[PDB]
Paper text:
Nicotinamide mononucleotide adenylyltransferase (NMNAT) was initially identified as an NAD+ synthase that catalyzes the reversible conversion of NMN (nicotinamide mononucleotide) to NAD+ in the final step of both the de novo biosynthesis and salvage pathways in most organisms across all three kingdoms of life. Intriguingly, in addition to the well-studied NAD+ synthase activity, NMNAT has been found to be able to retrieve the activity of luciferase from heat-denatured amorphous aggregation suggesting a chaperone-like activity of NMNAT. By combining multiple biophysical and computational approaches, we reveal the molecular mechanism of NMNAT as a specific chaperone of pTau. Taken together, these results indicate that NMNAT adopts a conserved pocket to bind both the enzymatic substrates and pTau.
Alternatively, we used mN3, which shares high sequence similarity to hN2 and is more stable. To identify the binding site of mN3 for pTau, we firstly determined the atomic structure of mN3 at the resolution of 2.0 Å by X-ray crystallography. The structure of mN3 monomer is similar to that of hN3 with an r.m.s.d. value of 0.543 Å between Cα atoms. The catalytic pocket that synthesizes NAD+ from NMN and ATP is highly conserved in the NMNAT family. The crystal contains two mN3 molecules forming a homo-dimer with a buried surface area of 1,075.8 Å2 in the asymmetric unit. Consistently, size exclusion chromatography and multi-angle laser light scattering (SEC-MALS) characterized that mN3 forms a dimer (~64 kDa) in solution, and as the mN3 concentration decreased, no significant dissociation of the dimer was observed. The entrance of the enzymatic pocket features a positively-charged patch mainly composed of residues K55, K56, R205 and K206 for the NMN and ATP binding. Lysine residues, K95, K139, and K206, that are involved in the cross-linking of mN3 with pK19, cluster around the entrance of the enzymatic pocket of mN3. The complex structural model showed that the phosphorylated segment is well accommodated in the ATP/NMN-binding pocket of mN3.
Numbering used by the authors:
A (entry chain B): 4 to 111, 125 to 234
B (entry chain A): 4 to 110, 125 to 234
Write the structure that this text describes.
């Protein structure tokens, strides 16, 4: 009933089959509750400001995400966060896309914008950078979390061990289906650096881009 | 070094990104040992005589495997096993393909090894098989490349069978995690429920399944 947009923040360094699968599982879960209609997915790669030494330039990560999504009919990459001239907090990215969602919807209930993350975020509060204490309440309260759990994640204990999460747990949606694609970008970077295969862990066009551009080779 | 062919037998009902990942991990492992040169991979779907209720017709399973292998330059699907009049034990499939390997001459003696996950390795060591002569022929004459599936202990499987223990030196344990922990059983259940299996299978396989109306209740 409620139209919803799923925003995924993170380094996407590189994007993998895990990140794409997260969108699919989350959309199925929200549709399965009966109360939501998922309209769009947004992949928002992190800004280069103060980035880790292993973080490749943002125009590469945007290009790889675009190649990864050419078989998707509902997820798009938005480079706005990465184009900003400063360090960006996730809550400000959500505010920006929420505003542009309210604008676009007026031209065509009112839509909602939710942050898509793994269950580990409920313990870590990093997407990919540690959120400020004063921003956690706004993210879980005004937007909400759609959490997909990898093996070994325990979202209900994470929510128990956090008073702010418990306070507003009604805006945290725990998807039930497993991720199965247990593929961190860290593993892919290590494998690439050691010359090991990453075929079938990320789309072939991303692998081709990585080789052509010489990324992730030490 | 010695040329090696990897053979995977199974239902492939449907093939998933897990099966293809297994081949890549196995080839990297063998190459890393320094003693082997992997020249080919063979996917061999099971005969329909086998025949559980949810086993789709072998024509479709080898069609889907062929579509999945379009982007591979070294793994092929061989429908020989599925075209025989009767189901065959794995060891007879190994015998057949080993003969084919020898006949395509030799660049030593090429070797043919069976590729499996640790869950199949588990099926080789239950106590009814501790004296089985086919299991022994598999590990003595061909050998095994085992890719570890999270939550399995291949070393204890090896130690619990006297046959596997005796021929442990022809059982190769790949170290890299599979990561694509995707069962065909999950995929069928999700397809029957209308759930997404995108990014769990090659896109052309999902398209074939949709176009053919497979796995729908």
């Amino acid at each position: 009933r409620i139209p919803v947009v799923l925003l995924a923040c993170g380094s996407f360094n590189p994007i993998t089959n895990m990140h794409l699968r997260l969108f699919e599982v989350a959309r199925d879960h929200l549709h399965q509750t009966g109360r939501y209609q998922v309209i769009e997915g947004i992949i928002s790669p992190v800004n280069d400001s103060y980035g880790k030494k292993d973080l490749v330039a943002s125009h590469h990560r945007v290009a790889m995400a675009r190649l990864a999504l050419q078989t998707s009919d509902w997820i798009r990459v938005d480079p706005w966060e990465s184009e900003q001239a400063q360090w960006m907090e996730t809550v400000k990215v959500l505010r920006h896309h929420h505003r542009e969602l309210l604008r676009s919807s007026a031209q065509m209930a009112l839509p909602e914008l939710k942050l898509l993350c793994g269950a580990d975020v409920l313990k870590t509060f990093q997407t990919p950078n540690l959120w400020k204490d004063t921003h956690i309440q706004e993210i879980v309260e005004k937007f909400g979390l759609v959490c997909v759990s990898r093996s070994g994640h325990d979202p209900e204990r994470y929510i128990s061990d956090s008073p702010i999460l418990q306070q507003f747990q009604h805006n945290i949606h725990l998807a039930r289906e497993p991720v199965l694609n247990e593929i961190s970008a860290t593993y892919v970077r290590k494998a690439l650096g050691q010359g090991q295969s990453v075929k079938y862990l990320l789309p072939e066009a991303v692998i081709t881009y990585i080789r052509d551009q010489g990324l992730y080779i030490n």
